[PDB]
Amino acid sequence: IAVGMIETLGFPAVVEAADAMVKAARVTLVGYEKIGSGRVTVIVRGDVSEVQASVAAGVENVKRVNGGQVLSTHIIARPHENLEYVLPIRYTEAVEQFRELE
Amino acid sequence: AIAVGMIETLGFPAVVEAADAMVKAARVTLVGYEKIGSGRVTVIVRGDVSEVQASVAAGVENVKRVNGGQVLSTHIIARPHENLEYVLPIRYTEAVEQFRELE
Amino acid sequence: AIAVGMIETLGFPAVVEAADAMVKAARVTLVGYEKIGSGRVTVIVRGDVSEVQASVAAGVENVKRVNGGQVLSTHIIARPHENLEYVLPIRYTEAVEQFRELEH
Amino acid sequence: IAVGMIETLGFPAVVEAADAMVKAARVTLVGYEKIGSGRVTVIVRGDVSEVQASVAAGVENVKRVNGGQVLSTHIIARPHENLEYVLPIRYTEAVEQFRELEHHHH
Amino acid sequence: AIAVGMIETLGFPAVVEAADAMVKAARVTLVGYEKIGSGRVTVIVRGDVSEVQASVAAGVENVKRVNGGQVLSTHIIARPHENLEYVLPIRYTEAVEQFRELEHH
Amino acid sequence: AIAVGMIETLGFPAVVEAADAMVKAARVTLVGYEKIGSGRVTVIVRGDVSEVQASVAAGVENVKRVNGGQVLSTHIIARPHENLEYVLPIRYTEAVEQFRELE
Ligand SMILES: [Cl-]
């Protein structure tokens, strides 16, 4: 169950990134992380090939944000279980309904 | 359309002006204000896609009147996937529903 | 309607002076102090629009005299839409209700 | 009851600024405020003439801090009552023993 | 003595890759994620010192595969003083207990 | 007088090294870790003034050998005024009482 991530500079772009990712494939948006200096990341979980398609769409679609900018992106095909318990990449009760349709 | 419209400014006074202009210019509801550090704050409206287009364009014009204001980014999402409302601050909150209840 | 006026400064001492000068210059209530990171802070006052206009002028002039003070932006909205009060920190709160009455 | 403030870049300078202020005159250190970009402010209250002396000393001492630096300072002699309900400059319970020791001039 | 290894990146996707490479490269425990503002975030692993050296070596190497990745700083303390845990966010916690049990020594 | 020693660094790994080298160098207690944003983080030790002087000097040297650490500022106050502890994060807590006893 891969994890996919798009970090942008600026909030409107991260919202476009989120929207494009879940529309382009069967992935679940599981969170949004702010780390300062305007850098915010959206995080999806799903089958790796779905996640790869999501992230590509997300990256492409930030291009249509006026002032949007992608700072970094990464996919991990098979994240180690320890990561879920420390980093905010885990599903929450709030998004359980979407994890279903994957 | 249940579009979402967003304007991100540098500076708080400009963002208050962007929100005030957007809700005056069309039938949209201001639902959120997000800070992501570094002086960047975004206000978020929801409504019909053509109303949101008008709001965002008005917000951008009106921030021009602000002494020291600046728009950093804007965007409209025409049909926000239902997953977004659960993770990102783009939904009506109880406070805004109080406002809407006055009608 | 009740106008809203705001002065945003780079530095906390300057924002305290801005607030102090605003409430002393005219009949306005200080209702908000907003921090958005990176040293940028804003004080927000509410009152009749002409009082708010006098206050904000006073605030900007007194910041200029703070050792290290700097105003980054200022703005006045004569008739803020009612939706704003439910989302942005511009509203009167119970803690400043006493000063609201002093306005009139 | 005046309010005196020194904003520094960096936290060790702000602690020195606080220490020099309360040692130089009978005022009370009531708080410290962080607003991002490494800017932190310490805040004292007291009689205006005592606060003047505290702030002068805090500014002198911060110059001895390895790497520290004052960014801004300011004293408001007779802060309006409204300020206290919105800005973080209030006395708190925790410092009332020092408030009692302030020297006032009538 | 249980070493502590740290990799600080500018940006969240790189920190997540650093963490993943660290726990895959050796038998250590990822115990924390610290944000200090300005984009700087750190991940912290604990375990035997030769394992922590391999984890930290691998996290640093894997951050290069992150598009837009940057490592800002890295450090390993072989035998961290006992005071450190009670003040700094480097402690083991219940949430990662299952992974501490799997550590190599 | 229980003196107070501080080292502020750029970056979390360097602050952990600063802390570590300080409590290893002399008889002081690590009581505090303060973040003020912009990557600036400060660690705070308490102890006898001559013990604090040695801790701070060691912490500065060891920080400079960290990969990417910088010492942004340091300072030592020999006899901090009583008022400081009720306002700033420099006091002992229960959590490190065990190490105070050891000075
Ligand atoms: Cl209230």
Query: What residue type is B57 in one-letter code?
Result: A
**Residues β-bridged to residue B71:** B9
Token pair in block for residue A48: 């790796």
Q: Provide the H-helix boundaries in chain F.
A: 12-25, 49-64, 83-87, 94-100
Q: Which of residues 47 through 66 in chain A touch E, CB cutoff 8 A?
A: none
Instruction: Provide the pairing of β-strand D28-36 with D39-46.
Output: antiparallel
Distance from residue C89's CA to the centre of ligand 1 (Å) = 11
Handedness of CA D80, D85, D88, D94 (dihedral sign): positive
Distance from residue C2's CA to the centre of ligand 1 (Å) = 17
Cα-trace Rg, chain E: 13
Contact A15 B77 (CB under 8 A): yes
**What's the order of all strands across the beta sheet hosting D39-46?**
D28-36, D39-46, D2-9, D69-76
State the chains in contact with A (3 or more Cβ–Cβ pairs under 8 Å).
B, E
Beta carbons of B83 and A25 less than 8 angstroms apart: no
Q: What domains sit in chain E, N to C, each tagged with a CATH number?
A: 1-105 (3.30.70.1710)
Distance of alpha carbon B18 from alpha carbon B12, whole angstroms: 10
CA neighbor of C85 nearest in space, from D87, B41, B33, D86: B33
| Interchain CB contact of A91 with B (< 8 Å) | no
Query: What residue type is C50 in one-letter code?
Result: S
Distance of alpha carbon B64 from alpha carbon B14, whole angstroms: 9
Q: What is the resolution of this structure in A?
A: 2.0
State the chains in contact with E (3 or more Cβ–Cβ pairs under 8 Å).
A, F
Distance from residue C46's CA to the centre of ligand 1 (Å) = 15
CA neighbor of C77 nearest in space, from B58, B60, B66: B66
| Interchain CB contact of D84 with C (< 8 Å) | no
Distance from residue C94's CA to the centre of ligand 1 (Å) = 4
| Interchain CB contact of C22 with B (< 8 Å) | no
By Cβ distance, the residue of C37, C42, C87 closest to B13 is C42
Taking contacts as CB-CB distances below 8 angstroms, the residues of chain E near F24 are 81
Burial status of residue B62 (CB atoms within 10 A of its CB: 0-12, 13-18, 19 or more):
buried
Contact C71 B69 (CB under 8 A): no
Contact C6 B16 (CB under 8 A): yes
Taking contacts as CB-CB distances below 8 angstroms, the residues of chain B near C71 are 68
By Cβ distance, the residue of C4, C73, C81 closest to B14 is C73
Distance from residue D45's CA to the centre of ligand 1 (Å) = 26
CA neighbor of A61 nearest in space, from A27, A21, A29: A21
CA neighbor of B50 nearest in space, from B32, B30, B28: B28
CA neighbor of B9 nearest in space, from A36, A70, A10, C44: A10
Q: What is the 3-state secondary structure (H, E, C) of E63-89?
A: HCCCECCCEEEEEEECCCCHHHHHCCC
Beta carbons of A75 and A51 less than 8 angstroms apart: yes
How many CB atoms lie under 10 A from the CB of residue F91?
A: 16
